[PDB]
Amino acid sequence: QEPPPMESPFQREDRNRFDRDRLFSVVSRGVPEELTGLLEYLRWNSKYLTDSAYTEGSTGKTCLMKAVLNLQDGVNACIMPLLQIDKDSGNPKLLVNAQCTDEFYQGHSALHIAIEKRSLQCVKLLVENGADVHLRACGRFFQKHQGTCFYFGELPLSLAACTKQWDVVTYLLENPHQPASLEATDSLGNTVLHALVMIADNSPENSALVIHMYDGLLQMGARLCPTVQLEEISNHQGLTPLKLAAKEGKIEIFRHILQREFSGPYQPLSRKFTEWCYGPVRVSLYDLSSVDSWEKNSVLEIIAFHCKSPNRHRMVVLEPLNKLLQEKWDRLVSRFFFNFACYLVYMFIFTVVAYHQPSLFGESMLLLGHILILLGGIYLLLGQLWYFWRRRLFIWISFMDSYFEILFLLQALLTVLSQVLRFMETEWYLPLLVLSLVLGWLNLLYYTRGFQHTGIYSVMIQKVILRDLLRFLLVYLVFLFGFAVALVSLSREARSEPAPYRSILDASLELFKFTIGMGELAFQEQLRFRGVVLLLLLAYVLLTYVLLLNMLIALMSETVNHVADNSWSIWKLQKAISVLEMENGYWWCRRKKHREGRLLKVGTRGDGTPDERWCFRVEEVNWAAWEKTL
Amino acid sequence: QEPPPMESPFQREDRNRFDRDRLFSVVSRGVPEELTGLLEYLRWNSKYLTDSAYTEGSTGKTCLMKAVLNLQDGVNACIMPLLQIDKDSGNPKLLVNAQCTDEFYQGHSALHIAIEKRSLQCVKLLVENGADVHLRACGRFFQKHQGTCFYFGELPLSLAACTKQWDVVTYLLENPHQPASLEATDSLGNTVLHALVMIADNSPENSALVIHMYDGLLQMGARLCPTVQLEEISNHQGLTPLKLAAKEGKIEIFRHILQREFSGPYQPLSRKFTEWCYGPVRVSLYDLSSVDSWEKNSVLEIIAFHCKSPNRHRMVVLEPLNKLLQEKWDRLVSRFFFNFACYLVYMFIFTVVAYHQPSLFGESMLLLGHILILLGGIYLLLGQLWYFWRRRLFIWISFMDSYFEILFLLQALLTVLSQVLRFMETEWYLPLLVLSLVLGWLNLLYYTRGFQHTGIYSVMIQKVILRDLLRFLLVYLVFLFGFAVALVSLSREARSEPAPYRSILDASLELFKFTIGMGELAFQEQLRFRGVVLLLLLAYVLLTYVLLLNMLIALMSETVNHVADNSWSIWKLQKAISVLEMENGYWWCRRKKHREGRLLKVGTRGDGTPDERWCFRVEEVNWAAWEKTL
Prior knowledge:
Organism of A, B: Rattus norvegicus
Shape of chain A: extended
Chains A, B: Transient receptor potential cation channel subfamily V member 2
Oligomer: part of a larger assembly
Entry title: Apo full-length rat TRPV2 in nanodiscs, state 1
Keywords: trpv2, TRP channel, cannabidiol, transport protein
Order of helices and strands of chain A: HHHHHHHHHHHHEEHHHHHHHHHHHEEH
Number of strands of chain A: 4
PDB class: transport protein
């Protein structure tokens, strides 16, 4: 069953002396007088406009919704008589407050539609007869997801500020009948600021919209709600608008929120206080309330771990994240390269043990090597398990940025399973041990991200190619399997040395050896159908080469498009993940975090008491920006 | 410890009846009257405004700096009473001349801040009470380096002309109290013209700024300082603004300085005198004072050797460098190709000697061949040593442009070591000799730069690829080493011919042979774990191929971007290095240099005497430029 459309001129409403159809037909055109005779009717049989007689069957839509959904020049003269009629009939559930009850448009009041229709002269008439302004609308059509959806915060005020409706916000905040509390929260927990950041796109025009509405709304709250801090309020997940804009991926408003500047009035609700400029240089004291890992759910921990957005790496470059992570990394590079040295020692010892191996004093040395390998593996395994315990979901998020933890876990697990399989006298321990050795020598490549010159190239290597290559792999695998079965099912026959293509796997090998550049094709004599095997081999080689060339060319056209080199940002982000995870310290010695930034007395908060915030002074010199001012 | 910020509204100043805090708090707001009671106080206890009581502890900042750092509409009415107060108290070290003493803002007078604040009406009040205008400010914050820095010449005048402040330069040069000497020099030795070229970027807007300020300032010096030549003055390294702009890499002002044209007044301070135009052709007499190698530190020797900038090769194309180097090369190509013939003779003789070799009349011929090889090697070694003696630092500068000298030195050294190791009866002389032969046949490729058609392609070959390829080399080397150790530590075991993968190096070979296109993979029987070796080999081949393709694609996206073909410029520069080094002649016969250009009497210099300069007439025909004028 499809959801009933809110307003269909053609499709009459469902059903699941004025009957409902006549009332709708007279309220749609907008004439007031054709309503006469209705009021007394209700007094005769005690019906009410909100009873299921006159409402739409499915969505519970009432008359007022129909009245407003059909406006002419923003005003429909039939609305006021409806309110007067309901007040005269004396209805318990006031008509204006009536909401839908379907799962699609739940809570969809009559006021949201007036706000969307951009008609203030109707919002006035609505709120001026008892319309409530906190009616959260939590229907599925309003919750953000894939498909048809419109997320605005499930609130009249949030919908006005979300819909550029400047003149309606001032009214909803400045009427004596029922002012809207600017800090109201919906089901999910969002206030209006969160809706603003949830609808924001990276697109420039919509980000301009949201920047403007955010600043204006915030100043308005500064006037109306001076005591309470609108910015620090969190939702039910535990995130503030800044953290939400960081997590969802909305950058272009995250930047403005992070480094916003106000002067004179509304100075306090600023996060970038320009300390001193001199020619080109500017020393600015960026606030970092809730962007320092010293808290529990800081913006860093959200950007790095919880965010899933292809522009996540563009948030770390912008100030003050860059200078902050640079200071942290300069502080912790010692411990990082010490980790590197320890792991390299472990791998060298592992190699030595794998290179001297009995085949069914040196004895004691090798025994100690085995034991030390076991201790290293159990330590590393506990480390990665504590990791994955802290970050349950991370690999669901970013496989291509965080698969090296998976490989470290795999290496530890394989080496420990290998050691116990050795102590179980089994002869299957050498394969697993040597495979763990391979994996370790490969996982060494993770530690190259400390250096710039090499991490740049590593992140110029680890591109999303692999997912594209997998599909070529599928096609080529079908090609190979089919042609191999063919060759074997045909060389099986001989004429009237091992027979070439004796099994299916050996055929697959002698077929794959063409891609390498070693494959051998030859007009043979043992086979009865020599010509057919030759022709089939040539068809396979031609097809494989067309396929390789096709994949390579498609890959090229998918890659080389002069796109901006996103290497530096990616490397900075990887270094950030590393340092941000290492700041917690190892699992056995939980390192005591150190606060960042100095605590400064900045003006006076809205309550009148001295405002004291943690700030971080950065010194950004931009010659080009300074030249333009001159 | 971080450097104390010059001006922090929030952070009170450090410390390392008017106390200091009250004085600062009253001078910041800018009211004059709240100063009353200060003067007599100083007379009571003999304190002075420059004593360490009222100054900032760390940076020695005095009150005046605070006064000026907080302006309103460019004027702070509290300044004049401060000067009057200090003069009334009779202080030895005049307050206005007070400077910081920290290592960061050393010498940072009160006048530099007034100049930066773009307030002339305050510079007037400052200089009109004894402010000195030559106070060099040599703090580390001002010296150009990596990081936060602002280089302007460490002088008030240099800062005004560096900061677009036209109206302040005229004042600093045209006041009766203390005019600024336009030829003043800072610590490093730079005058203002050098600061102008040190801040210049290749960016067009900033180069426009610097061109304009340079021309204006130079005319102003022509009026005020007619006797002295502002352009020829050098700094402590021995460079003039032209040589400095060539060395640092600043092209867009180097061009304008080189070919600048003035008419009528200020005609003499021009370097391009238009001799005669005819339709499209223009014969212009470019001055070459200090761009001819006949001097000691000419611009050519700086461009070619001392410059480190990716646009160095764009300076040689522009006139008059192009025509000059073309004439020099046309003169010296004979000697160049004679060098080529001699070296090719030496290499052919070396090949012949290496191709006839005893293994543990022809005797005498081979002995003479050995002896002649030794003489050639010792000659070439002395040549390259004299080279590296003249140019100590060059290879630090441009490895990719000057590594062939390194290879020539290496070849000579190896052949001489080879000959002596032969005369020491050792059997290790043949490897070194043949390696020297390889190196020589390769170093022959240096002499191809005489021809255009082939040097173009050579410089289209020698691109910076190698540095990128090294990092792929690192990754692939780890891959290979790990998988080789694996294969050997697993083939070591056999079932219940040499065993394949018998050592680690042989495994590395049989693994590298896949990249070449010859590698062999095969389901073997000798090994107990045949399946595992097969699977590991396939994983390695797949990984290597993904890696090769990834590197190739990244390299492609890094290269093919329709960038301007910088081949011709690069080849011209290489030919220029060659001819500019060859003009000195060989080390044993120091060739007598020949002057370039004719000596002409151009107008009259500022002293009134006849001006005589060395000029070079070039004939540039530009059809497109001429068409626009019509």
